[PDB]
Design an enzyme around this catalytic site. Structure first.
Site, PDB file in Angstrom:
ATOM      1  N   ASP A  66       0.811  -1.213   0.000  1.00 33.64           N
ATOM      2  CA  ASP A  66       0.000   0.000   0.000  1.00 33.64           C
ATOM      3  C   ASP A  66       0.849   1.270   0.000  1.00 33.64           C
ATOM      4  O   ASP A  66       0.332   2.371   0.215  1.00 33.64           O
ATOM      5  CB  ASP A  66      -0.941  -0.007   1.206  1.00 33.64           C
ATOM      6  CG  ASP A  66      -2.115  -0.945   1.021  1.00 33.64           C
ATOM      7  OD1 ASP A  66      -2.216  -1.947   1.767  1.00 33.64           O
ATOM      8  OD2 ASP A  66      -2.937  -0.671   0.123  1.00 33.64           O
ATOM      9  N   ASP A  72      -1.594   8.687   3.930  1.00 30.89           N
ATOM     10  CA  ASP A  72      -1.904   8.057   5.212  1.00 30.89           C
ATOM     11  C   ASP A  72      -0.773   8.077   6.242  1.00 30.89           C
ATOM     12  O   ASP A  72      -1.025   7.935   7.439  1.00 30.89           O
ATOM     13  CB  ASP A  72      -2.393   6.627   4.990  1.00 30.89           C
ATOM     14  CG  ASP A  72      -3.701   6.583   4.247  1.00 30.89           C
ATOM     15  OD1 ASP A  72      -4.616   7.356   4.617  1.00 30.89           O
ATOM     16  OD2 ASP A  72      -3.810   5.802   3.280  1.00 30.89           O
ATOM     17  N   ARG A  91       1.132  -1.519   7.203  1.00 29.86           N
ATOM     18  CA  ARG A  91       1.528  -0.282   6.532  1.00 29.86           C
ATOM     19  C   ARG A  91       2.518   0.547   7.347  1.00 29.86           C
ATOM     20  O   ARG A  91       2.994   1.579   6.886  1.00 29.86           O
ATOM     21  CB  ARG A  91       0.293   0.562   6.199  1.00 29.86           C
ATOM     22  CG  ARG A  91      -0.660  -0.081   5.203  1.00 29.86           C
ATOM     23  CD  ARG A  91      -1.601   0.958   4.596  1.00 29.86           C
ATOM     24  NE  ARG A  91      -0.840   2.079   4.052  1.00 29.86           N
ATOM     25  CZ  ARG A  91      -1.376   3.183   3.541  1.00 29.86           C
ATOM     26  NH1 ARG A  91      -2.695   3.332   3.487  1.00 29.86           N
ATOM     27  NH2 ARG A  91      -0.582   4.142   3.085  1.00 29.86           N
ATOM     28  N   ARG A 138      -9.298   2.661  11.560  1.00 27.17           N
ATOM     29  CA  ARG A 138      -7.889   2.975  11.357  1.00 27.17           C
ATOM     30  C   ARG A 138      -7.390   4.050  12.310  1.00 27.17           C
ATOM     31  O   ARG A 138      -6.212   4.074  12.667  1.00 27.17           O
ATOM     32  CB  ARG A 138      -7.652   3.434   9.914  1.00 27.17           C
ATOM     33  CG  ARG A 138      -7.891   2.362   8.867  1.00 27.17           C
ATOM     34  CD  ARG A 138      -6.825   1.287   8.935  1.00 27.17           C
ATOM     35  NE  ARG A 138      -6.945   0.327   7.841  1.00 27.17           N
ATOM     36  CZ  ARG A 138      -6.453   0.516   6.620  1.00 27.17           C
ATOM     37  NH1 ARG A 138      -5.809   1.638   6.326  1.00 27.17           N
ATOM     38  NH2 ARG A 138      -6.609  -0.417   5.691  1.00 27.17           N
ATOM     39  N   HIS A 166     -12.804   6.056   5.253  1.00 24.65           N
ATOM     40  CA  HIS A 166     -12.007   7.102   5.866  1.00 24.65           C
ATOM     41  C   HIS A 166     -12.835   8.363   5.764  1.00 24.65           C
ATOM     42  O   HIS A 166     -13.778   8.418   4.980  1.00 24.65           O
ATOM     43  CB  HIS A 166     -10.690   7.291   5.121  1.00 24.65           C
ATOM     44  CG  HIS A 166      -9.679   6.224   5.396  1.00 24.65           C
ATOM     45  ND1 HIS A 166      -9.837   4.920   4.980  1.00 24.65           N
ATOM     46  CD2 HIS A 166      -8.493   6.267   6.049  1.00 24.65           C
ATOM     47  CE1 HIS A 166      -8.791   4.206   5.361  1.00 24.65           C
ATOM     48  NE2 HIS A 166      -7.962   5.002   6.013  1.00 24.65           N
ATOM     49  N   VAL A 261      -8.762  -0.743  -4.651  1.00 24.97           N
ATOM     50  CA  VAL A 261      -8.164  -0.898  -3.328  1.00 24.97           C
ATOM     51  C   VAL A 261      -8.319   0.377  -2.488  1.00 24.97           C
ATOM     52  O   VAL A 261      -7.461   0.706  -1.669  1.00 24.97           O
ATOM     53  CB  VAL A 261      -6.689  -1.343  -3.413  1.00 24.97           C
ATOM     54  CG1 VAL A 261      -6.594  -2.692  -4.110  1.00 24.97           C
ATOM     55  CG2 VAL A 261      -5.845  -0.316  -4.145  1.00 24.97           C
ATOM     56  N   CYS A 267      -5.338  10.529  -1.673  1.00 21.06           N
ATOM     57  CA  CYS A 267      -4.603   9.456  -1.013  1.00 21.06           C
ATOM     58  C   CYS A 267      -3.196   9.265  -1.578  1.00 21.06           C
ATOM     59  O   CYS A 267      -2.313   8.766  -0.882  1.00 21.06           O
ATOM     60  CB  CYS A 267      -5.378   8.136  -1.099  1.00 21.06           C
ATOM     61  SG  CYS A 267      -7.191   8.266  -1.126  1.00 21.06           S
TER      62      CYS A 267
HETATM   63  C1  GBG Z   1      -7.628   9.018   0.667  1.00 26.60           C
HETATM   64  C2  GBG Z   1      -6.963   8.062   1.628  1.00 26.60           C
HETATM   65  N1  GBG Z   1      -5.802   8.401   2.186  1.00 26.60           N
HETATM   66  N2  GBG Z   1      -7.495   6.847   1.711  1.00 26.60           N
HETATM   67  C3  GBG Z   1      -6.808   5.797   2.438  1.00 26.60           C
HETATM   68  C4  GBG Z   1      -6.815   4.660   1.417  1.00 26.60           C
HETATM   69  C5  GBG Z   1      -6.002   3.483   1.903  1.00 26.60           C
HETATM   70  C6  GBG Z   1      -6.105   2.348   0.887  1.00 26.60           C
HETATM   71  C7  GBG Z   1      -5.204   1.215   1.356  1.00 26.60           C
HETATM   72  N3  GBG Z   1      -5.367   0.054   0.471  1.00 26.60           N
HETATM   73  C8  GBG Z   1      -5.570   0.803   2.783  1.00 26.60           C
HETATM   74  O1  GBG Z   1      -6.494  -0.021   2.941  1.00 26.60           O
HETATM   75  O2  GBG Z   1      -4.875   1.316   3.684  1.00 26.60           O
END
Ligand code: GBG
Length: 275
Positions: A66, A72, A91, A138, A166, A261, A267
């Site tokens: 990711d 993030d 992550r 999260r 999110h 995904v 993002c």
């Molecule tokens: C816009 C944003 N920052 N969205 C987070 C997306 C994360 C996607 C990734 N595959 C995950 O599940 O962490």
């Protein structure tokens, strides 16, 4: 100092392992990784080639499927960068290379170190006046606390976020004092909470598709008030809403592959204003 002003954009390349191993909120069609790389390339093209931002392109890491979603792992306000502690344990190592680039960009770094705290940058909406922080799977309260202490000049308020969403899965800033918002029940409820907690009311730009409420706003000096939005091929009725912003420079950008995904527009980049 105007809202949306930026000079740098940090992005990160896709690993091949994304297609099968990137986290996703729902089962769906297969990720076309080669095509996803093309869409990411166009995306980077807009930010750097077309808009003139100095783009830092972080190399991919196959152990971090990711790693492309750099939003993030870092939240930037003025010259201060909050390096987050991502909600997904898989992550967390994405932090390492982000810290490197931001140290090179010479920002004031603060890293989320409390082992009880989690926060995804995707859960954070900086309006230019304050922060709203989604409490989700999260992002927890402790994560929000650390963000509040890091940017003490600004008010920070929490908003409940459901399922595998999110905060910015259904909203983003479309301009000064202007929140792009989805039309779903979830999105409206979140907006009401945001409006109810804030010191001021915000103007809004309502779009029929939640996902298309995620856009990128850039104030580019001597060029325009730029808005990167999803294409008319992806979300026709939402693109029509953006098209009414005559004073904005509108740039349609596809994210169809990475959407599989949960990868939207905000993002895939971290925007910095470096004087
Ligand atoms: C816009 C944003 N920052 N969205 C987070 C997306 C994360 C996607 C990734 N595959 C995950 O599940 O962490």
């Amino acid at each position: 100092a105007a809202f949306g002003r930026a000079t740098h954009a940090v992005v990160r390349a896709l690993p091949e392992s994304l297609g099968q191993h990137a986290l996703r909120s729902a089962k769906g069609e297969e990720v076309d990784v080669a095509r996803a790389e093309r869409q990411h390339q166009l995306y980077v093209g807009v930010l750097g080639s077309k808009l003139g931002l100095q783009v830092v392109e972080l190399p991919a890491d196959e152990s971090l499927p990711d790693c492309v979603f750099v939003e993030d792992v870092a939240v930037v306000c003025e010259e201060t960068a909050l390096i987050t502690r991502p909600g997904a344990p898989s992550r967390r190592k994405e932090v390492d290379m982000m810290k490197e680039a931001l140290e090179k960009l010479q920002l004031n770094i603060v890293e989320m170190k409390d082992e009880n705290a989690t926060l995804d940058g995707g859960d954070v909406l900086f309006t230019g006046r304050e922060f709203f922080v989604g409490l989700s799977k999260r992002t927890n309260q402790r994560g929000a606390e650390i963000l509040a202490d890091t940017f003490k000049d600004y008010a920070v308020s929490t908003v409940p976020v459901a399922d595998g969403l999110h905060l910015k899965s259904f909203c983003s800033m479309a301009g000064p004092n202007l929140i792009a918002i989805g039309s779903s029940e979830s999105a409206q409820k979140a907006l009401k909470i945001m409006q109810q907690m804030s010191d001021h009311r915000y103007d809004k730009l309502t779009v029929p598709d939640d996902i298309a409420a995620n856009c990128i706003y850039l104030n580019i000096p001597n060029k325009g008030h730029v808005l990167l939005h999803r294409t008319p091929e992806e979300y026709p009725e939402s693109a029509k809403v953006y098209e009414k912003l005559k004073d904005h420079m509108l740039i349609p950008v596809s994210m169809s592959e990475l959407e599989k995904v949960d990868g939207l527009l905000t993002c895939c980049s971290v925007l910095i204003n470096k004087k």
